[PDB]
Amino acid sequence: GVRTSPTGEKVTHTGQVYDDEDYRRVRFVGRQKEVNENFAIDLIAEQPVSQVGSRVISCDGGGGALGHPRVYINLDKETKTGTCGYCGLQFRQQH
Amino acid sequence: TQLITVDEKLDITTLTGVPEEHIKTRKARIFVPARNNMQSGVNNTKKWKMEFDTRERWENPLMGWASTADPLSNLVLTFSTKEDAIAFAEKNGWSYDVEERKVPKPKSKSYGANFSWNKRTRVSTK
Amino acid sequence: TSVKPIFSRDMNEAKRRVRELYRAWYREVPNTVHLFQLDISVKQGRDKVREMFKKNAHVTDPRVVDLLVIKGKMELEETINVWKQRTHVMRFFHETEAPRPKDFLSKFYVGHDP
Amino acid sequence: TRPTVRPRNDVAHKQLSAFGEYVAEILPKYVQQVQVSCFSELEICIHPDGVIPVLTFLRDHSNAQFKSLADLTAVDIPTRQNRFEIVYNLLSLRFNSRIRVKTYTDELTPVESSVSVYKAANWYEREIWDMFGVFFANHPDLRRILTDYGFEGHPFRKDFPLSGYVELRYDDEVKRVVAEPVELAQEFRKFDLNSPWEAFPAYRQPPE
Amino acid sequence: SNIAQKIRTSSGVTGDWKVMNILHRIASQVAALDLGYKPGVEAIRKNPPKMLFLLGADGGCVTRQDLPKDCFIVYQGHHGDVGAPIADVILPGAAYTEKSATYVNTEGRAQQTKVAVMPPGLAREDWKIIRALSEIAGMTLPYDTLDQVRNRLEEVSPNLVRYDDVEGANYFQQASELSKLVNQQLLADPLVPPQLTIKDFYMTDSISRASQTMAKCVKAVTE
Amino acid sequence: LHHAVIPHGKGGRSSVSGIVATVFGATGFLGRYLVNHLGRMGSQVIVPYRCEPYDTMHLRPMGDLGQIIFMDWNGRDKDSIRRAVEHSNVVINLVGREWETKNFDFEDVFVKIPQAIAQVSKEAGVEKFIHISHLNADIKSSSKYLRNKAVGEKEVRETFPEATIIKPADIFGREDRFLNYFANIRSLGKKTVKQPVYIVDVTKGIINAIKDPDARGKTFAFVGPNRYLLFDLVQYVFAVAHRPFLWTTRDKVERIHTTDRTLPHLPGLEDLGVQATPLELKAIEVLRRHRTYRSEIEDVQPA
Amino acid sequence: LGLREIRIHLCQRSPGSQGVRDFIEKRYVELKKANPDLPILIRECSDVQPKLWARYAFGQEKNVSLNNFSADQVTRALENVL
Ligand SMILES: NC(=O)C1=CN([C@@H]2O[C@H](COP(=O)(O)OP(=O)(O)OC[C@H]3O[C@@H](n4cnc5c(N)ncnc54)[C@H](OP(=O)(O)O)[C@@H]3O)[C@@H](O)[C@H]2O)C=CC1
Ligand SMILES: [Zn+2]
Secondary structure (H helix, E strand, O other): OOOEOOOOOEOOOOOOOOOOOOOHHHHOOOOOOOOOOOOOOOOOOOOOOEEEOOOEEEEOOOOOOOOOOOEEEEOOOOOOOEEOOOOOOEEEEOO | OOOEEOOOOOOHHHOOOOOHHHHHOOEEEEEOOOOOOOOOOHHHOOOEEEEEOOOOEEEOOOOOOEEEOOOHHHOOEEEOOHHHHHHHHHHOOOEEEEOOOOOOOOOOOOHHHHEOOOOOOEOOOO | OEEOOOOOOOHHHHHHHHHHHHHHHHOOHHHHHHHOOOOOOHHHHHHHHHHHHHHOOOOOOHHHHHHHHHHHHHHHHHHHOOOOOHHHHHHOOOOOOOOOOOOHHHHHHOOOOO | OOOOOOOOOOHHHHHHHHHHHHHHHHOOOOEEEEEEOOOOOEEEEEOOOOHHHHHHHHHOOOOOOOOEEEOOOOOOOOOOOOOEEEEEEEEOOOOOOEEEEEEEEOOOOOEOOHHHOOOOHHHHHHHHHHHOOOOEOOOOOOOOOOOOOOOOOOOOOOOOOOOOOEEEEEEOOOOEEEEEEOOEOOOOOOOOOOOOOOOOHHHOOOOO | OHHHHHHHHOOOOOOOOOOOOOOOOOHHHHHHHHOOOOOOOHHHHHOOOOOEEEEOOOOOOOOOOOOOOOOOEEEEEOOOOOOOOOOOEEEEOOOOOOOOOOEEOOOOOEEOOOOOOOOOOOOOOHHHHHHHHHHHOOOOOOOOOHHHHHHHHHOOOHHHOOEOOOOOOOOHHHHHHHOOOOOOOOOOOOOOOOOOOHHHHHHOOHHHHHOOHHHHHHHHHHO | OOOOOOOOOOOOOOOOOOOEEEEOOOOOOHHHHHHHHHHHHOOEEEEEEOOOHHHHHHOHHHOOOOOOEEEEOOOOOHHHHHHHOOOOOEEEEOOOOOOOOOOOOOOOHHHHHHHHHHHHHHHHOOOOEEEEOOOOOOOOOOOHHHHHHHHHHHHHHHOOOOEEEEEOOOEEOOOOOHHHHHHOOOOOOOOOEEOOEEHHHHHHHHHHHHHOOOOOOOOEEOOOOOOEEHHHHHHHHHHHHOOOOOOOOHHHHHHOOOOOOOOOOOOOOOOOOOOOOOHHHHHHHHOOOOOOOOOOOOOOOOO | OOOOEEEEEEOOOOHHHHHHHHHHHHOOHHHHHHOOOOOOEEEEOOOOOOEEEEEEOOOEEEEEEOOOOOHHHHHHHHHHHO
16 A cells, blocks of 8 residues: 555655665664655556546535636646646546 | 033944844845736836845744744834935944836837838837 | 934043943943853853944944933843843853854855855 | 615724824824724824824713724835834723824934823833834833843734844753754744735725 | 948937947856957967867857867866866856856846756856866865855955846947957858757757757657 | 754754764763753753652753753663663763662673663764763772773773773752762761763863864863862861761762772863862852851861 | 056036046057057046045055046156156
8 A cells, every 4th residue: 555665764755765874764673654655656557547527617625615616617638638726636538 | 401412423232122133143135126027017127125034934843843043034114215214324323225217218109100111119009 | 414313512521421331331240141151251241242342333323322222221120129030130141152253264164154 | 785784884984984083183283194984983193203193182071082002003105205104092981983193203212201181001001112123202111012021023913024133942061042043943934825806996006 | 230320420419329249158257258259269279289178168169170189178067068078177157046056147137047946967166166176176265155255256346246237338439449450351151140940949059959848849840 | 964963053942063972971069060061062862860850950050941851871782771771972971870789789880881871872873972080090999990890991991992081070059969968968088089070061061072083082181170189178078067066878989989080191171171169259150058147268278 | 566457537517527528539559559458447436536546556546636627637647657
């Protein structure tokens, strides 16, 4: 689920793992580097690419006042799916 | 009353409590701030800001912040004329560089010359 | 520029008040160094009192010297009372500076410091 | 204009206009600006030679009682020659009125020290001396209220920075609390929030 | 200058208009010719030295191949790419957003930078390094701080304190008659500027060479 | 050196100086003052402790937010010591109890402790290891204490050759052992030259030796500026303590009757460059607790 | 040994600038024809005292002031220096 450097310490979702010439490896002695082991990139590549039969479609976020404000996105390119900046989940068109 | 008669500069620098390091080490840039060029508004003009030079802002080695050995760096003194700026800077003691106020040039634009006959001011796209 | 005074008329009363205040600070030190249980001999305390009086030596305006006399008289009253503690009287000194040097070369080895 | 807009009254506005004109008629020597704002509170802007005559007149005279004294401050304004503005804020008891006597001064001028005609102004005057730096002559006691004894610099000015020059910490060398120059752990990010586009056209000063 | 004197003669003098002017590429050449340096590298081609200071030598100015064995190249600057492997002593000078400098444009106006960010690393300023080097060597430079440096700057050339202000020169006749002593053969080879296209605008500096955004738009233009 | 090891700006209190010091012992007297001066420098101090966390709690608020760090260790396992000096710029050895126990003796504390830590700090790959030892530590007799410290000096000179052996005299301070031991009594009268040196001059010497190289390898000795007699020292400390009066082991009394001598074959304070202070100022500092309420500066200064 | 540089510092409205402009318009091609390798350089800013600086021999910078000297007097003092 997570990568780990050959120094033995876990990387994060941001690649900030320390080198061989630091002292923060010594500040982590005896106390665990509480890293979130749940990356945010790979939980979207597992999502189904939705296919909506219109041309320009809405995005709420699953609930009135529970979610991002409405974005209306366009689906006119043929090789690149439209992508909500808030959501991150894609759409396509069907005709 | 009005007993004192003297025409001399003021010497408040020994009264304002700031030490000699921050008296004779730094310098005051006195300037109208430039217009924030992405916006288009000169309400940010008309105020002579006095600011100081910036100094070192290293990294706090536990979080990654910007620690600083600078009390005076986060000041700004908005004034209304260059003369009172120079008077305050010479009164309160420190050095000063007074920059210049650069007005926008009064141009003359004309839509009728944007649609001329023989001249090269033919926009060809509107 | 007919300015209202504080106390004086010219530098003569300024010199008179500052020598009165120095006489008071001279006769005020050994009582305090016996009272607050400090760690510094009387001669060093008197030398730094006269150093504090020699620090402001380039001041010429009579109102400013009057206001410095007022500052010194306020602090002498607060030290002849027992209001100020051992901390502030030791804070007048400088024992915990590890003081930064003034040569250009040692300011160059620890740089970004004009 | 009826919902969610504060309704102003004109009776108090006319009365405070008439009373400010009356005050400036009967005291011609010390009066420069007589202004009434939109929300009807009187302001009288005053030369610093008449603090005792204006306040002895205003505590008495039986047509304006003004027994009570409130805030005194001397708002630290640069850009002028005379910086500080001392604001006596007088409240009556028989009348329900509020006037602000605003006298001006610079850094090195004794104003006439209203402690003899308002006993409430004792700690107000001592606090303004300690925080701003305006000396008050013919006054019983000036000490430092609301500041440390070893601290100085008159910190409420615009010239004194936000963080001070000294910072205390305990150390075990001399076994006590010592003062050191400030080494902050975070920057205090100052934000550039003053956006353009002139949110009030009614307050445009005339240009050069 | 022949064209300039030709229009100077064969016309009525309508005013102090100036026909002739040149333009430069880098501002420090204008500053170094104001302070009175030798332009070109011919004085080094004549006398090969035993010690040389490369204050930001960008390209193939000199190498170790154009010089005797005991080189002693002291490079001083930031992110050197050509010469920094070749050099002997590397000193980390500051950058153009990182020090209080004094720059001259192509028309003589003096414009100064401001210290917005202190240089990362040890990374001292340039004249600070040079005066400390003077102190550690057996001599001295007779000034301490930056106001004394700018006072010597005025005591070398006076226009470098009147900031953001211009004053043009004169004496086109004297310059033209001083040009009339040495005749050179004009080679009829096709003269061409090197700045011919977008890629050669984008790559031909050290700061633009070190970046990645310039490399991205270089491959975008060339592809 | 990597970045975040370069210094930044002024000194102390989230002003990053450029050293990471692993400081052994450090719970007692001299280590606490040295951690005080390193927190004033603005460094990272790795203190290992084997005791209760209450004593490192009392020395805790010295450094800034997360500058100093705490870790456990023992005198038996090399793994915890190598974990302590995994990544460290410098390491200093300040250890040793003035009386025996049932688990650790004068034997093999000064032989088994510094060999193990010097071995693992050479193998971990650090530089500038500073070891304190007592003055006049010789193979010659009359103290198990002093002969064990002499064997320790020889062993830390043998392994890890680029070490800084430094040796103070009988240091005195605010929470001293021997001067407080003199004040807490009831006594004899003999003659013995002895020179105390004040603790803040010694630790300024240590921090100058720890950040000022060209002093690596050479052993240093701290000499106080006084060098006078013990009998007049006892009478001066009683006269400043306002009392006339005309764990106490045999090794301690033979240490305070050992004639401390100095040899100028190794340089002192001036070739390192910090001013020394005389007795009397700091003596009037430390000699509190006279009586209920209760100057005559003796200043014998023999030879 | 000898000279290295001669620097002239001028202005645009002065009787001293009038005198040194008389010199520098009448007798400058002569001087540059005489000494080839002396970079005698001229500077003009807005208004300053017309200084004349001779830099040579390990930073010896000798100073003369050409305030209200006429062109003969300028040439005589310049030959006194050089
Ligand atoms: N008269 C003096 O004070 C002089 C002292 N010295 C040297 O100074 C050093 C410190 O002395 P000082 O502070 O006065 O006395 P301490 O005994 O109190 O200091 C020694 C430190 O090391 C610890 N320690 C000692 N033995 C062991 C052990 N077996 N296992 C683990 N930790 C141990 C101590 O207790 P803890 O385990 O609780 O941490 C303490 O932290 C000594 O090495 C001594 O040789 C040198 C010259 C003069
Ligand atoms: Zn969305």
